C-alpha cells in the first residue's frame, strides 16, 4: 500500500473546487488507486516476461490497460495516457 | 520542472517511477511508462471524483461521502465492471 491521498485531493480540487471529501471516502479512493496500480504493474510485468522484453515501456502500460479495464473505460484511459506521454516528450 | 508538470498531471510521476522500479516488475522501466500510468490513475480518479461530486451536489451536500462514491460507481456500467461493489 502507498498513499495517493494528497494527489487524489489535487484532482478533486480541479474537477470540484467547492466540494470536500470525508476521511472514509478518501480512504476508499486511495484503496481504489492502489488496487489499479497493482493490477496494471503486475499485468505489464506479465506482458514483458511473455515476450522476453527487458523494459516496461508506455506500450506495455497501454496493453496492460486493455487487458485490465473494460473496453470503453480502457479506450478513454489509453487516450489520456497517450495525451500525457505526447505532452511529456513535446 | 517535475516529470508531472512536464506531462500536465497532478498524479506523482516520480513516485510512480520509484514504485515501478522497486516492484521488480522488469529489468528496466522506461521514462514514458510512469507518465502513462500516472495519467491512467489520474483519469480514473477524475472520473470517480467528477461523478461522486455530482452525486454529492444532487443530494444537496458539500462533501463527498462513501455513499456518493457507491452511487457514482453503481450508476456507471464501466466503473461497476472495474470496481464491482463499493462497501
Curated annotation (Swiss-Prot), chain A:
Family the entry assigns: Belongs to the histone H2B family.
Places the protein is found: Nucleus; Chromosome
GO cellular component, one term: extracellular region
Cross-link for Glycyl lysine isopeptide (Lys-Gly) (interchain with G-Cter in ubiquitin), residue positions: 87
Primary location: nucleus
Protein name: Histone H2B.1
Lineage: Eukaryota, Viridiplantae, Streptophyta, Embryophyta, Tracheophyta
Keywords carried by this UniProt record: Acetylation, Chromosome, DNA-binding, Isopeptide bond, Methylation, Nucleosome core, Nucleus, Ubl conjugation
UniProtKB/Swiss-Prot annotation, chain B:
Recorded GO MF terms: DNA binding; protein heterodimerization activity; structural constituent of chromatin
UniProt PTM: Not ubiquitinated.
Keywords: Chromosome, DNA-binding, Nucleosome core, Nucleus
Induction: By phytohormones. Transiently by wounding.
Known tissue expression: Low level of expression, mainly in dividing tissues: floral buds, margins of newly emerging leaves, expanding leaves and the meristematic zone of root tips. Also expressed in many non-dividing cells of the elongation zone of the root.
Role: Core component of nucleosome. Nucleosomes wrap and compact DNA into chromatin, limiting DNA accessibility to the cellular machineries which require DNA as a template. Histones thereby play a central role in transcription regulation, DNA repair, DNA replication and chromosomal stability. DNA accessibility is regulated via a complex set of post-translational modifications of histones, also called histone code, and nucleosome remodeling. Required for the T-DNA integration step of plant transformation by Agrobacterium. May play an important role in illegitimate recombination.
Name this polypeptide is given: Histone H2A.6
Annotated source species: Arabidopsis thaliana
